[PDB]
Symmetry: D2
């Protein structure tokens, strides 16, 4: 036997950081969950009980906290790049660092219409994420994403003209509910190293803001022919607005809301134009995926 592939490190490292402006009193908080997995000349740790090649996962955890102490943790694309670059530069035998960051929302509270200097609310479990792959000799590959953005529209969704055969029961509809959890990923041009990442820093927050705004506006305004057709419009708009993105990927559940026929009870009319009460379906769910690039 032989090792064909190997990576190891520390997962689920919870990190908080505070910035304190001691001139204004304004405090800003950041909270994330970090995973760092390393690759390199480590096969002997598996094959020969050779722990000399192991940078302990416990040491990787310490390094995450130290790096957060020594650097801004925002945007997460930059933090992940600094952290990944540390491992491949520090250790001659480590050749790749794979950094995943989940950013948790701490939105400043408005109290009596004024932003509070040091109080925050988790406005929803929506995440901003990065996957930063730092590969010696191959630069820095960044995928940025938003996930767990849960939305619903009560009309201006349609689904008709689909294939109908002996497996088909689904009625065509010209007016349905559409609800999803948005998972949207934008894949950056390869960066040569930390300098090139730093040269583009403002684009990270700006492209995340664009991706979110385009997702919400397209969802709300598209008289949707399908999940497929609506998600493609989101992707093409995001590509049009940031030349440093190569691809946009959407992964969208179709979280079904079924009509309830109540006509068996006192002739109640609750279908078609009279549909008011629906049964949200926990499972199963449509799952629709696209990766869109430049033609």
């Amino acid at each position: 036997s032989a090792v064909k592939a190997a990576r190891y490190g520390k997962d689920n490292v919870r990190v908080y950081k505070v910035h304190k402006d001691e001139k204004t009193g304004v405090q800003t908080v950041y909270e994330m969950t970090v995973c760092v997995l390393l690759e390199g000349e480590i096969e002997t740790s598996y094959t020969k009980a050779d722990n000399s090649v192991i940078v302990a996962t416990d040491s990787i955890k310490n390094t995450i906290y130290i790096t957060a102490k020594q650097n801004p943790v925002t945007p997460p694309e930059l933090f992940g790049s600094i952290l990944g670059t540390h491992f491949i530069e520090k250790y001659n035998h480590i050749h790749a660092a794979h950094v995943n960051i989940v950013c948790h929302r701490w939105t400043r509270m408005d109290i009596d219409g004024k932003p509070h200097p040091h109080s925050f609310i988790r406005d929803s479990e929506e995440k901003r994420n990065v996957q930063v792959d730092v590969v010696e000799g191959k630069g820095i590959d960044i995928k940025s994403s938003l996930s767990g953005l849960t939305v619903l529209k009560s009309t201006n969704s349609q689904f008709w003209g689909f294939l109908r055969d002996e497996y088909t029961t689904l009625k065509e509809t010209w007016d349905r509910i559409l609800s999803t959890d948005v998972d949207a990923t934008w894949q950056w041009k390869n960066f040569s190293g930390l300098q090139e990442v730093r040269s583009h820093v403002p684009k990270f927050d700006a492209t995340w803001a664009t991706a979110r705004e385009v997702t919400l506006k397209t969802f709300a305004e598209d008289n949707s022919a399908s999940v497929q057709a609506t998600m493609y419009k989101m992707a093409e708009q995001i590509l049009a607005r940031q030349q440093l993105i190569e691809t946009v990927e959407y992964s969208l559940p179709n979280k079904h809301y079924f009509e309830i026929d109540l006509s068996w009870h006192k002739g109640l009319q609750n279908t078609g134009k009279n549909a008011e009460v629906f049964a949200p379906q926990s499972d199963p769910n449509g799952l629709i995926k696209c990766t869109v690039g430049r033609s």
Copy 2:
């Protein structure tokens, strides 16, 4: 043997309802999860296989959908009262209906600064809940609550002057992080029946709004001596603002954020006044509970 207590019915009934203003085009959505459990002269279903006394849980589910079709589903205090009253009035042998409703957030989207007529976002997993106990001859007992309201303040939290003995390691602090998930419950005066509930309908949304506003403002503005002292201030303010509430109950985790001593690494200073990077603790957690009434 004998039945000392019995209740049964349907749990986890997911319900959606849409209101459509066909004059303005504005659509409004409501989504909840409903549980209805019945009590009454039902012991023989347990003791003698006597299913004649069982209103099938499947029929309870149908009744939830029918009631939602025939009535507004807001405020949940009213909906729960209508639903509970249905079972004790319809069935001579059913003497109590216990209705629990969890209300899910669907907040109207703002697109280009304008409220969208039919698109919504789940802004966080915060819930508004009711427990409505409709008991034949004993009226309607309502407990209203907000839950899963997750907040953090980065300073203006203290914890000192606690008991110190041979079991104590905790350092006193005059400046710490405080984070919790707010579970706040207000218990209404007993109502005689549906008419009395209906006579107070506006107070339900108003008292929920008060409970939330008081929670957020007190949390943000109290230079906290403890979770105990801060939560008591929230309760006393809510009681002062609604005479139809008898008690306010808070159940608050203390979601700890630990300092990380980094002085072992290049003399890094990350404690006390220099604390920037913290380790959020998933478990264990302080758990602090109060029920506050009028003196």
Copy 3:
């Protein structure tokens, strides 16, 4: 305003303990999650920022670990009694300790048909639990439970002769699937203190084993008329087998498995006697509860 009720302490305290027989080499592991909440003369911590009455939740956590070091952690009824008794005896102003323990399964591995001396498997997420309420002057109230015991029978379940009215669509059946997650609780006679608990120690493991055996055998062998009728048989048998139990409580979901009519496709027969493929329903679920005592 005034404090009507108050309790506080530490939740979600994960504890592991190992016993090592250094004569046989056999090691035995225990893992639990502990919650301790205290009551007593603590209202001033809420009303006057008086932290002098607070035994810090951090100190409660330390005390859990110290108590586990100084005592066996099995059976959990005894451990919870020792832990609760510590707080009301140690602190003059603490008058109640409420101890909840969840016991996690670590079942010894059988390797090549021989029990391994120090390797364990989590055979399912089934829990053994206790709630121990130690109240100064009122002794020790223990509720023992098993929970998350997930079972299914593919036949010998029936449901007919239930109430049928204008809310009813459910077809009577003489042959259905029955599946549940068993939550069974047995409530002990009040104990005067730790000595009386210790005098009954063997009964705790024996009564848990009885409750589990009776649950499984009754579920498997009862040609069930309803969840109600089957659960009552379990309760009456457990009461018959342990005179120191006062009540037995079951809380059982009816985890529905729906027939799928496939007759629309090539006349496939998949209902009634021909039913082979079913759709497990995640929600909603029947929820059936009983408390059974001696007549």
Copy 4:
């Protein structure tokens, strides 16, 4: 813009099937969760609102139930192959079917030492899984796995001789707890189509049984130098025992159990040789991955 990649279908399809031997009365149950995603000439559904190319996700769901009715659902490698082959053969424009199956445990109950004919227990949340990729012109690629197999050993785990630098605090140890959740995957030789899969059917259950037995025996018996060294031994043994497997992959968390120094309290000794009470750590966790092939 252009579609670079696209797949869609139905996720989270819960399926139950019963087999009834009407000669012996013995009933056997199967429960799974199925996902089917299709690829093919479907880009116009995204780009031009062309629903004619869409086999509705609802129809994919119907097809899963119909296929389960018409075929055995075991082993899952065969069921997934039949299901995937259906879509690429039935639809000229569908060129790939990606079938993921999670198999849920329903283990026959033993009542009074006799196997019960129709009663089952979920002995733990351990899963048996398949990923079956059926690609027109490229045959059938199967990855088999077991997941959520949670184990602990209380000794005969070591971790020393790892890299020590200015980022390192971890003490070397010659005796620690090792606990993990086993995720093990074996990747089959490419199969030309359904006939070749069928020709190997007995090997699926046999190789799953081998993978589980080798995992448990190696974990229990290896005086472990690291997670790396132990998992490699499992992989090399599984490869040695089934020539139709090309690779074995393990993904293992190191679920840490920390010593608790209690020497601050009455000089209690709970470290090193005296360590009895430990603090299970929910997060962070080491994460160790290998893919092993033939040299």
